[model samples]
Target: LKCNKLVPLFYKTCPAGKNLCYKMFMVSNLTVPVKRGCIDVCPKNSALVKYVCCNTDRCN
Candidate 1:
């Protein structure tokens, strides 16, 4: 997968077997933060956090 991250933070390739691109957004105290990358499996979303995953390149 073509992994991506917020600017200033370098993004790198996912492991050869990881085929899914994932994006996560979390509501924690005051600020809402987000992250994107690759994973073999996506985790469950919670009330405070949201998760999205896809198979296409840079789909996160």
Candidate 2:
């Protein structure tokens, strides 16, 4: 599920080009589910970021 509830608040200039830019996204208060399926599928030693599950909406 994906959630687009959060809005981006800031932007930064990218060294790549004038049209290229980086965004500073806002962090959500939601908490990600720690399911056994994810752990089993994810490779060991891989860096994993915490994901939050939406209750009534989908986020990507």
Root-mean-square deviation (CA) per prediction: 3.4, 12.6
Segments in model 2 whose C-alpha atoms lie over 4 Å from true places:
1-6, 9-48, 57-60
lDDT of 1: 0.69
Measured by TM-score, the strongest candidate is: 1
Writing each residue's lDDT as its tens digit, candidate 1 over 1-60 gives 567775457376776767788877777777454777777778787776788777776553
The total of clashing pairs for model 1 equals 0
Give the number of the best model, judged by lDDT.
1
Instruction: Write candidate 2's Cα lDDT for 26-45 as tens digits.
Output: 23455333221101122223
lDDT of each: 0.69, 0.25
Residue 48, candidate 1: alpha-carbon lDDT:
67
**Clashing pairs in model 2?**
2-58, 2-59, 2-60, 3-58, 3-59, 3-60, 32-51
TM-score of each: 0.61, 0.18
